[PDB]
């Protein structure tokens, strides 16, 4: 038994993604361990997303706002790409009010105390001289992917239109193992994980939440 405890050391490639290297340990452990973190990263990272939204002029998703170029059903799909972070312990509502010709982006949204928008440059809708768009977005806690929570289940009457919520701070995770010195001198493996995030949290803090999830899991 060649005994040297595994050592996890950080790295950096970009900001939203940074590599991690753990070395050394027994053969055959690279592929089974690196994937077990990937399955946990891609699913169980506690995230922040938008649950339901409400627009004053529209009563449902299948109408159009006067003056705007995108229909309501097309704006909801454009709002699905919103990356957001929030502690929030509670349901809170954001606000978006824009007027006149221009372009409504994610930066025009006013985040309440405790939440923040991480992609103010994202396009939402194009407004013209007659275009007036005011909306209200309810942000809530969660993880993974929950479909639209219908108001028939939780009475949130006609006004609100539920939207599919995606709490996934992770973007793309991969890995590759390099088992050096397979000769008669010794035997060990070492792997490197490539963890990427949506800018909601850093790769380092994402791996920590996946590590704490597994540590408390095995019993």
């Amino acid at each position: 038994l060649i005994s040297q405890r595994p050592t996890l050391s950080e790295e950096t490639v970009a900001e939203n993604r940074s590599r991690f290297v753990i070395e050394p340990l027994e053969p055959g452990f690279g592929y089974t361990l690196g994937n077990s973190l990937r399955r946990t990263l891609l699913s169980s990272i506690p995230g922040a997303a938008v649950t339901s939204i409400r627009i004053d002029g529209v009563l449902h998703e299948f109408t159009t706002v006067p003056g705007v170029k995108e229909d309501v059903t097309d704006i909801i799909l454009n709002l699905k790409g919103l990356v957001v972070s929030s502690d929030d312990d509670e349901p809170v509502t954001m606000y978006l009010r824009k007027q006149g010709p221009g372009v409504v982006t994610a930066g025009d949204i006013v985040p309440p105390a405790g939440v923040t928008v991480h992609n103010p440059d994202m396009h939402i809708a194009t407004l013209n001289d007659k275009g007036k768009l005011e909306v209200e977005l309810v942000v809530e806690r969660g993880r993974g992917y929950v479909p639209a929570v219908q108001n028939k289940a939780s009475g949130a009457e006609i006004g609100r239109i539920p939207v599919d919520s995606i709490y996934s701070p992770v973007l793309k995770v991969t890995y590759k193992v390099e088992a050096t010195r397979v000769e008669q001198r010794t035997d060990f493996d070492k792997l490197i994980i490539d963890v990427e995030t949506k800018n909601s949290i850093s790769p380092r803090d994402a791996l920590a939440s996946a590590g704490g999830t597994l540590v408390e899991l095995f019993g």
Partner: protein
Amino acid sequence: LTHKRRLLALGVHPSHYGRMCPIETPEGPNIGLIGSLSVYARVNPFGFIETPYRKVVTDQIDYLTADEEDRHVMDVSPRQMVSVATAMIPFLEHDDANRALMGANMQRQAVPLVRSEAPLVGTGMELRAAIDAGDVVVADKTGVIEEVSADYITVMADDGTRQSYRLRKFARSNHGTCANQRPIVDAGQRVEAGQVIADGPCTQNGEMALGKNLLVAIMPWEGHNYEDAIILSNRLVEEDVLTSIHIEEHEIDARDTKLGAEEITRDIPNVSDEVLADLDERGIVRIGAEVRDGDILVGKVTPKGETTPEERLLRAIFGEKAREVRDTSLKVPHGESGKVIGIRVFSREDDDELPAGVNELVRVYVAQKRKISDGDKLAGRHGNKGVIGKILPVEDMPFLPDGTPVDIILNTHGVPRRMNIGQILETHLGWVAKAGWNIDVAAGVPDWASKLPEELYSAPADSTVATPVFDGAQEGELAGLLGSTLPNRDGEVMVDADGKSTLFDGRSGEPFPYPVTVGYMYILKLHHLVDDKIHARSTGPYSMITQQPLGGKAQFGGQRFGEMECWAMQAYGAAYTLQELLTIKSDDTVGRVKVYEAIVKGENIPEPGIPESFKVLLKELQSLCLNVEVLSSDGAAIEMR
């Protein structure tokens, strides 16, 4: 577009070549009687079908027909005998005529998706067939856009005239598919005549988009893609790539009834205040409200018979009254749900046109956003089709070393009987087009690029490609592109010259031992959907003449047990099971009520009676002047009654 140009042949050959293709004849028993017109076919005033061609190679084009068949010496172009639906299948020459035929029918079965992403690899017919279909917004005169809105688009012509186009927004089609038009231009743009101003339902940037581009893996995956089934990534459900909107119309009418004229009202005879909570002052479902199975859409009452003692006592005790009435409300059909987009009401107060005696007519339109679900039928352009076996979470999927999971997982075993080669060709070209390529010419161009033009080299990622049916790509040029692949972010190459890659099992983590073919194939969402095709019935209405249950109405259709099924039931020797189906489950007037009673109490199920079908049989014999008598061992004749 293909419903038009279709023709009934009721009244193969050399004259059928270039005039009417038997290639798009239906796969049913009507094959040969029904065909679609060829792409370039022209009709002579007397009815003769004139094929265009160029006399041999003269530049002039003359009408070819049986008169031109007398003196027959050059054809006008390829795909003369190919119709529009068939000409949109890439690598048409490789697939069999059967698979080519099925591919045409599969394309006209697609449903419009909310996103409407254009095909990554295809022919040149997507553009020409989209604008001429009529569901796309085309510019009449050259000019500049004055205003652009979701409602309409105005164009300021250089001539000074002003044209405007109102866009169909979530319009219910004939078969219930949402027809929605998206403006593709902005105010400052300058548009030429004939240009596409807005996309139709199944078009993107002016060309037909009947499906999406998805990452495919051709490895068999633990039997979940067994025999036809297809496995999908949960990403498709999360990102609404295969999601489609479906709208259905419901109608109900008013007076001119049997015992008098009834009125449509919010008031229901005896219901809880929470049941009508979503109903408005008139009694119609308020727009934007959600409706589940059984909810009332339009409230309505009928004239009463006004003629039980046990019910009147409770009525008098608690104070309710025999206010007439029979409840007749338009509820949502069992097994469907959605939101109410609009209501159209036609009343009698206003002078409107309506049938005689009918006072009020109201139509309610309900829309559904349908996520892709297991059981839905998907298909490609080559005729391949199959249900969705399973939807795997994005975490556990065969994924490239990038960490990029595959969207769908196909199976190989279909090839060594049907061979469908074209399906594999566009799969590799789908990856070639997604990642781009650069031939990296050194000391000239390779020999496979001999017949190629120069523009085909060095294309960036996500580039659409056009391969005409018979003049399109060939095998040599493909592998040459397979050798050239622009790497990804980190510079690693994900696909070799064989179109295969080493995928990692998302469950065990181990890599798959062999390289698996991956690529991008264009698949469609067929009109057959799980929500429409699932049926279940415990108890429901029954027909009048025959007391059997009745399927085909808005609720609770019963399944048919034929004699072929009765033959199998007899082969097993199960006498009771066969008797239960044919007497107390179907036709016993007093049977099916006492069984539902015994089941509720939890008692034994009683012995069946005489099926109503047999009692009707005896009367039919008596009316024919045939005296039939059912004799027991004694008590000579017994009467059913």
